[PDB]
Ligand binder design. Structure first.
Ligand SMILES: [Mg+2]
Ligand SMILES: [Mg+2]
Ligand SMILES: [Mg+2]
Ligand SMILES: [Mg+2]
Ligand SMILES: [Mg+2]
Ligand SMILES: [Mg+2]
Ligand SMILES: [Mg+2]
Ligand SMILES: [Mg+2]
Ligand SMILES: [Mg+2]
Ligand SMILES: [Mg+2]
Ligand SMILES: [Mg+2]
Ligand SMILES: [Mg+2]
Ligand SMILES: [Mg+2]
Ligand SMILES: [Mg+2]
Ligand SMILES: [Zn+2]
Lengths: 99, 208, 126, 60, 82, 116, 155
RNA sequence: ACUCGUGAGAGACUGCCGGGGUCAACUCGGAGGAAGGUGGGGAUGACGUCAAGUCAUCAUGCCCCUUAUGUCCAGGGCUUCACACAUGCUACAAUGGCCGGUACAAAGGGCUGCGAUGCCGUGAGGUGGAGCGAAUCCUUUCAAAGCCGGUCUCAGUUCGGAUCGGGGUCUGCAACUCGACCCCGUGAAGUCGGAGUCGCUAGUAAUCGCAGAUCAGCAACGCUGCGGUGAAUACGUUCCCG
């Protein structure tokens, strides 16, 4: 049968786990099967900058950008359940890609 | 360059980002727009007293929350200022905005606003010792405040030799990560140049 | 089944201790193909020489990550843990010989301003 | 960053290779990161302010 | 070197001028700022005043100069010695 | 042995021995010995006059070496100098000709340090 | 070591010969962390020793060690601006460290084509008491005995 | 089911046992435990100092320019070279060079971008484009040192790879000044470096590759980071520096 994959991305892990609950709950309430939130490896982008505006090349500050990832695979997409997934209100902090 | 910015030091633990969105491809464009917005807002309600700007983005929705000491000047009773700002906002941004002009509960607990208040007094040639002590007393009376530090540096009193003075009351544990430190900085404008006002307000510990 | 994991540096090995006569299937190879170095062989089999069961078992191992010497050290740990499962009363002898410790020694991160973790740039007074 | 140069860096050049990135906040030509569009100085400042989502101080 | 797929590079303007002159059988002095154009065999008898950043240097083309760039014959930096 | 005016080293393997000819390096040596079918592992001791003949015939046919090559190299440098190209001026000055640093280094061309 | 002596790292036992002397020797041959190369250099040298002397290699290595180990040593001390070579006793562990360092360093200076040859020949000569490492020991003692007068510093 | 990824949690407290101790701090040793005594390493810089650095990121008092000290463009310069200093890289070789075979990583990057097969080139690369916004596909099934075998045999060499001649590739409107890379030839100094001087106390030093930011291309041997292989020594505080 047809399957929908929801890739969820966020910077904070708390927002990502909270929004994986909201989706799983919505799917359970509409009676579909939900494989669940599978945790994918976090992406870490690292930037190194000189602290001073001029000449102090031995003073540096490292910055980080973590992106957390959660895969939610929903089986048995009842068209009511599909409509529900499209009508969930989720924080801007979380990016939702639905396939 | 001795002191790490207090906000950035705690940014993952005790304080939170001043803008919420996710974008991969649009990240650079989003930042450019944010720069434009915050420069348009920081040079508009100067005498309104702004503490925070939070920018939320999603699709085309641009939610701008402006925290201000008194919203009276930030919205005329005819909506005049809200309409003017939204006009320049949507113009600049390209999309639709919803100015959620809020207000701050305890103006005198807010380090950015306390910094603005000291700075404006110095702009009105008030003795800097006076303004420092005034801010200290006002903040410490309020219930959350467990300590405050205020620092002013520059040509204080119009002298030719830079002075850097600071007054402190209570605890200000800058090295403690769990300590809730509110930081504010404002640049007072004077006939002899600019003098920088920094305020640290300790409000207790956060465990999460 | 008996299964255990041993770790050393960046090498994780999964050992399957089964009864046998002293055979090693390290990813499909013997203990002379995978680990030609005699020092590494003496190391992998050191726990067995402490229990005295050098030829009383077969071992099957999955080796991944790290390098030859890391994987050798992870193997010795895994095996020693498997021996604790087979015969708990060997633990006083095996831990006294130190085979149950996970060696926590890892590569120190490179620090800015320095060429490596500790090596500093050449200094000059003038 | 003379304002003439900031504008000239925003114009389309007549050759694709004359295009170069300038910091979106201050106009600094050197050390401009592609993903942020900011120079190392503005990056540090804004990141400390929490004005760059997901960007935090890095330790390991 | 410029790859053979693309052939030799010559600034369109420069080409135009030398063509005209040799088409109208004339060897005038051609004022040129183009350091970067290659010497085509069509140039063999022409004279070029090429910019060195300070002035124009007279370069008389010869058989042995073909395939060199024009700027190779107008030295930029002056060094008399220390 | 004797080959195109060059005395090959006493007992060196063929692939190395041939590099002593001013036009031949290790790649051209392996090429020449492959085309002639002489074992590159042979010593110069064991090289027969017949093999020397096949060697001379191939490299005099296809390859330009020794004097012929030196004359051509000198002619190429001389041309640059004569026509007055930038590289020719660099040859006159005894300075790097391939746009290398001169503030420091450039010693191979400049000779030993004549400290001032 | 202002706060006191630091612990010595345990040395393993050589799998082929079962002397910890041998693995100490490989840690002196060790360059650039290429332990496997140093290992086969030492094993090769002991095999060359075994075939040349007929006898057990570890036994002859120990004999060569005992003929190159210094018992008495000189430490320099500035005293009144004059500098005095002071005789000091060598503790056992330092003796073997010195002996092994001397053996390997003079083997590196030897003339034979390869390190396996140079090391084996230096070990054999030192077993007989002929080698450069033996001369070094004798010169170390010669300087100690010539400075016996300055022993009273006892530093 | 084992790994692993990422969420929550446990665990180290001088907590326990023996001897030191002001029945004190704290200390020496032992048990248990993955770890033992702030376990290892980041982040974190008090009151001040040096009228330290930055008016060229930005901002700003005062002074100066406004037919120029503003501003557009082509060409040149920032790449000069009798020298000197400083930080590095590659070497002087056999614990090595070269050829053949074969084993074991981590971290990271990718959209007018990363690009697989196949085919054509000795090769840089060409052609064409599968598949991937990526734990999926590409960056070979991702390394080099390593291990096995053969060859060179102490020679300025089969060490070294500077320089210079010729022929090419790719990016770019364009590689003269002034790019990187490839192929053929060439084959410099250099035989372990004077007085003096630098770094490092264990996964450290030494050595080996890999990736990233900037970036059309690159002067990257730089910088930031990642793993592989892995030492020696520390009696001690007389002497030098802080
Ligand atoms: Mg000096
Ligand atoms: Mg550019
Ligand atoms: Mg030759
Ligand atoms: Mg602390
Ligand atoms: Mg000064
Ligand atoms: Mg100015
Ligand atoms: Mg120009
Ligand atoms: Mg420069
Ligand atoms: Mg070579
Ligand atoms: Mg010489
Ligand atoms: Mg030599
Ligand atoms: Mg230390
Ligand atoms: Mg690049
Ligand atoms: Mg390393
Ligand atoms: Zn900037």
């Amino acid at each position: 049968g047809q399957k929908i994959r929801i890739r969820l991305k966020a910077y904070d892990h708390e927002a990502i786990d909270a929004s994986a609950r909201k989706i799983v709950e919505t799917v359970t309430r509409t009676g579909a099967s939900v494989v669940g939130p599978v945790p994918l490896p976090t992406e870490k982008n690292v930037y190194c900058v000189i602290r001073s505006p001029h000449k102090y090349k031995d003073s540096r500050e490292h910055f980080e950008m973590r992106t957390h990832k959660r895969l939610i695979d929903i089986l048995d997409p009842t068209p009511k359940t599909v409509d529900a997934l499209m009508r969930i209100d989720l924080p801007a902090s979380v990016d939702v890609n639905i396939q | 360059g001795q002191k790490i910015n207090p906000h950035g030091f705690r940014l993952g633990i005790t304080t939170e980002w001043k803008s919420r969105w996710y974008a991969d491809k649009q990240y650079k464009d989003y930042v450019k727009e944010d720069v434009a917005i915050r420069k348009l807002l920081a040079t508009g309600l100067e005498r309104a007293g702004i503490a925070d700007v939070e920018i939320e983005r999603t699709r085309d929705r641009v939610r701008v929350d402006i925290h201000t000491a008194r919203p009276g000047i930030v919205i005329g009773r005819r909506g005049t200022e809200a309409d003017r700002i939204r006009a320049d906002l949507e113009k600049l941004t390209g999309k639709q905005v919803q100015l959620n002009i809020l207000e701050v509960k305890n103006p005198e607990s807010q380090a950015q606003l306390v910094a603005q208040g000291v700075a404006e007094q110095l702009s009105n040639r008030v003795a800097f010792r006076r303004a420092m002590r005034k801010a200290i007393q006002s903040a410490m009376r309020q219930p959350n405040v467990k300590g405050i530090r205020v620092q002013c540096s520059g040509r204080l009193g119009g002298a030719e030799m830079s002075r850097s003075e600071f007054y402190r009351e209570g605890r200000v544990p800058l090295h403690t990560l769990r300590a809730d430190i509110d930081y504010g900085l404002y640049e007072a404008k004077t006939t002899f140049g600019r003098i920088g006002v920094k305020v640290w307000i300790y409000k207790g510990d956060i465990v999460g | 089944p008996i299964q255990t994991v041993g770790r050393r540096k960046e090498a994780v090995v999964r050992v399957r201790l089964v009864p046998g006569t002293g055979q090693f299937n390290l990813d499909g190879r013997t203990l002379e193909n995978y680990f030609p170095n005699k020092v590494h062989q003496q190391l992998i089999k050191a726990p067995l020489v402490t229990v005295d069961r050098v030829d009383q078992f077969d071992i099957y191992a999955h080796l991944d990550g790290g390098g030859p010497s890391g994987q050798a050290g992870a193997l010795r740990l895994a095996i020693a843990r498997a021996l604790i499962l087979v015969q708990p009363e060997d633990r006083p002898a095996l831990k006294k010989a130190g085979f149950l410790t996970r060696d926590p020694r890892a590569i120190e991160r490179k620090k800015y301003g320095l060429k490596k973790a500790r090596k500093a740039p050449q200094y000059s007074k003038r | 960053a003379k304002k003439a140069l900031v504008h000239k860096a925003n114009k389309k050049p007549k050759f694709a290779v004359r295009a170069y990135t300038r910091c979106n906040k201050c106009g600094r030509p050197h050390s401009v990161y592609r993903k942020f569009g900011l120079c190392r100085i503005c990056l540090r400042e804004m990141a400390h302010a929490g004005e760059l989502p997901g960007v935090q101080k890095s330790s390991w | 070197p410029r790859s053979l797929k693309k052939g030799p590079f010559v600034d369109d303007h420069l080409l135009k001028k030398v063509d005209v002159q040799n088409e109208k059988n004339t060897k005038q002095v051609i004022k040129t700022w183009s350091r970067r154009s290659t010497i085509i065999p069509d140039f063999i008898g022409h004279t070029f005043a090429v910019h060195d950043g300070r002035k124009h240097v007279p370069v008389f083309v010869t058989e042995a100069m073909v395939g060199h760039k024009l700027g190779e014959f107008a030295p930029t930096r002056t060094f008399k010695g220390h | 042995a004797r080959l195109v005016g060059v005395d090959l080293p006493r007992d060196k393997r063929m692939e190395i021995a041939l590099t002593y000819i001013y036009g031949i390096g290790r790649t051209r040596s392996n090429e020449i010995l492959a085309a002639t079918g002489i074992d590159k592992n042979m010593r110069t001791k064991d090289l027969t006059d017949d093999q020397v003949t096949v060697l001379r015939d191939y490299i005099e046919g296809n390859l330009k070496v020794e004097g012929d090559l030196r004359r051509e190299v000198q002619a190429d440098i001389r041309r640059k100098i004569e026509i007055g190209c930038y590289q020719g001026l660099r040859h006159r000055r005894g300075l790097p000709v391939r746009g290398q640093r001169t503030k420091t280094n450039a010693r191979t061309r400049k000779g030993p340090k004549r400290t001032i | 070591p202002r706060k006191g002596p630091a612990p010595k790292r345990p040395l393993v036992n050589d799998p082929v010969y079962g002397s910890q002397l041998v693995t100490q020797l490989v840690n002196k041959v060790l360059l650039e962390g290429k332990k496997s190369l140093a290992e086969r250099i030492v094993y090769g040298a002991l095999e060359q020793a075994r075939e040349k002397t007929g006898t057990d290699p570890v036994v002859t290595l120990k004999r060569a060690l005992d003929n190159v180990k210094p018992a008495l040593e000189v430490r320099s001390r500035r005293v009144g601006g004059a500098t005095y070579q002071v005789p000091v006793e060598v503790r056992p562990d330092r003796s073997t460290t010195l002996a092994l360092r001397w053996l390997v360093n003079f083997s590196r200076q030897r003339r034979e084509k390869t390190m396996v040859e140079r090391l084996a020949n230096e070990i054999l000569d030192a077993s007989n008491g002929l080698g450069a490492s033996v001369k070094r020991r004798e010169d170390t003692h010669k300087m100690a005995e010539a400075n016996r007068a300055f022993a009273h510093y006892r530093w």
